[PDB]
Each structure stands twice: as structure tokens, then as C-alpha cells.
Design a protein around this nucleic acid. Structure first.
Ligand code: MG
Ligand code: NA
Ligand code: NA
Ligand code: NA
Length: 310
DNA sequence: CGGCAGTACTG
DNA sequence: CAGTACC
DNA sequence: GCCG
């Protein structure tokens, strides 16, 4: 990154817009931050700034300011509420609307939230694990969590396939959470296993809290046995076999890679979701038995998971 | 002017 | 439904 | 915020 003198300044703004709920502006900043950090040289001119996709007039100007006086005026006018809104929206289950409401009601600290705020069941769990959910785990711990789910699943049916995706599948050294995708080639046995599987992982003591307990998605909290262990976020998603390749791709990400893939699909009159690659104007699901087929049908060369970490 | 993703949950 | 979350 |  030859532009952290620009990037770290823009990240303050990006985050301020995000926690205040201006998600589109915050998206624009994030896309420019990525662009800025991947270019091969320091940006030196306004017309050089305009040259990179994702940097437009207003963002060009903002680099011009940093380029010179070494600072950005806008940064000194960010609402004093931003750090508190960030604090609050880092509670799992509380987003920008809840953070702003708590702020308006006068709360300023997690002690205020603990003592005075009305919390949903999910937010109480997020508050209880506030520090734990901000930490990343070493990838060897993600492996242990994956293999815990897999052995519990394969005990029920040995043909169940279980794959940790997210940053773990992209080869990263640490992971914020473990996303375990499960399917079955028979196209049928995947159905209605949560009953047994979640009971099994609960029996262990492995599952400590449930955030979402749905027909096809589980989101919750686990902890491995022994001393010195943290609570970790764990998602388990069960998918029909025919959707496995698109699910793998989506839940492997990264989020910005998926975003680029959806736009490319749109340019070709298709749609790409976690369930399928389709035509669009319902639409025709195209057959994608493997991740390679998704790339091929988009006219793209295959990228293994590790070079999707955008 | 307006999309920038579409679901799956929760209550 | 609005809000939040998944990548 | 960017871009078409
Ligand atoms: Mg993940
Ligand atoms: Na540009
Ligand atoms: Na949150
Ligand atoms: Na996850």
C-alpha cells in the first residue's frame, strides 16, 4: 500500500458514515480505499486520482487536500457521537438504527447498555461476548471447530459433506468466525438434520449460545474444551447439493469479490446468489456442479479461494 | 436519476 | 413489516 | 461516495 497517508484518513470517514447509517456513501469510500491500496504507486495528481476506478471528483479533491497540508479538514467535523455509535453497533444484533436510538436516549457506554437498555435475546448474547466477538481466532482453531461440527454431522450420516468457508477457506492465518457449509450428494439427506446435529453439539457443551435457529441457517456461539479458550462465532448452513457450488462461492467470499461477481453477472444478463447463477430480465437457473462452472459461465478464468481475498 | 444483492431470521 | 446479519 |  503506497498510499496509507491517504487510506487511514479515508477509513475514519468511511467508518463514520457507516455507523451513522449512510451505507451507500460508506460503500463508495470503502471501494476507493481498496482502489487506493492496490494501485502500484503513490498518487501524485488530481488527474492521477481520477484515473483510478472508484475515485471520482469529490474523492479526488480529498486526496488533493491530504497530498498538500498533510491532513483532511472534514475529519475535524465528525460528530462526537461516532465513537459511541461504533461501540454500540459492535454488539452483535445491534445495527445503526439501534445504536442511534440508544444514543438519542442518552446512553454512552456499555455499562449504560447493560444497566438500562432493553436488549433483544440476540443483543444480550452479543453484549455478553463483546470482547470475544471482536477477536479473530488462529486458523488452527477454526480447523478444530470445523472438525468438531464434521464429526458430529458424519456420526448421523457419514455421507454428509462439511466445509469451512470464509477467510478460512481463503487461506488466511486468522478468522473472525467459522462458516460451516453442509450438503449431501444424495440431494435429500441434508434435510432436517439440525434437530440431531445441534442437539449433539449442545450435549458436548460445545454450543454455548444460539443467535439464529432457522430451517436452513444456524448462527451461534461455541467454545472448545480446555483452559484458555474463547467463545467463537459459528455459522452452520445446510444446502441442497445442486446449490453447493454457488454456496461455496458465496460463503467463501470475500464480500467485495462477491460484489464484483454480481456486477459482472449483471453485465451479462445473469444473476448470481448464494443459491444459483441464473438468467434475469422468473429466470432460468443454470447448472453449476462446481465453482469452476460459475466462472466459466461468466466468461471468467477460475480463481482459487486464496485469490478471492478482496 | 438511481443502482450499488438477495435471502433468512426475529419479533 | 423494519432491522440485522451472512459473504 | 462512484458510475452509467
Ligand atoms: Mg466467516
Ligand atoms: Na475514476
Ligand atoms: Na452489530
Ligand atoms: Na459467519
Amino acid at each position: 500500500n503506497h498510499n496509507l497517508h491517504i487510506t487511514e484518513k479515508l477509513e475514519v470517514l468511511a467508518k463514520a458514515y457507516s455507523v451513522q447509517g449512510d451505507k451507500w456513501r460508506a460503500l463508495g469510500y470503502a471501494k476507493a480505499i481498496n482502489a487506493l491500496k492496490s494501485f502500484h504507486k503513490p498518487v501524485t495528481s488530481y488527474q492521477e486520482a481520477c484515473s483510478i476506478p472508484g475515485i471520482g471528483k469529490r474523492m479526488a479533491e480529498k486526496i488533493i487536500e491530504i497530498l498538500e497540508s498533510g491532513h483532511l479538514r472534514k475529519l475535524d467535523h465528525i460528530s462526537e457521537s461516532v465513537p459511541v455509535l461504533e461501540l454500540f453497533s459492535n454488539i452483535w444484533g445491534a445495527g445503526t438504527k439501534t445504536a442511534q436510538m440508544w444514543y438519542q436516549q442518552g446512553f454512552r457506554s456499555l455499562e449504560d447498555i447493560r444497566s438500562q437498555a432493553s436488549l433483544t435475546t440476540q443483543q444480550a448474547i452479543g453484549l455478553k461476548h463483546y470482547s470475544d466477538f471482536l477477536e479473530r481466532m488462529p486458523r488452527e482453531e477454526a480447523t478444530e471447530i470445523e472438525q468438531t461440527v464434521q464429526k458430529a454431522a458424519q456420526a448421523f450420516n457419514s455421507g454428509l459433506l462439511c466445509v469451512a468457508c470464509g477467510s478460512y477457506r481463503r487461506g488466511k492465518a486468522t478468522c473472525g468466525d467459522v462458516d460451516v457449509l453442509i450438503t449431501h450428494p444424495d440431494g435429500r439427506s441434508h434435510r432436517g438434520i439440525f434437530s440431531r446435529l445441534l442437539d449433539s453439539l449442545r450435549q458436548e457443551g460445545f454450543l454455548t449460545d444460539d443467535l439464529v435457529k432457522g430451517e436452513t441457517k444456524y448462527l451461534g456461539v461455541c467454545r472448545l474444551p480446555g483452559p484458555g479458550r474463547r467463545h467463537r462465532r459459528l455459522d452452520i448452513i445446510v444446502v441442497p447439493y445442486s446449490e453447493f457450488a454457488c454456496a461455496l462461492l458465496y460463503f467463501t467470499g470475500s464480500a467485495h469479490f462477491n460484489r464484483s461477481m454480481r456486477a459482472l453477472a449483471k453485465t451479462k444478463g445473469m444473476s448470481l446468489s448464494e443459491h444459483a447463477l441464473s438468467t434475469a430480465v422468473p429466470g432460468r437457473v443454470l447448472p453449476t456442479p462446481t465453482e469452476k462452472d460459475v466462472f466459466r459461465l461468466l466468461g471468467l478464468p477460475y480463481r482459487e479461494p486464496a485469490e478471492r481475498d478482496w
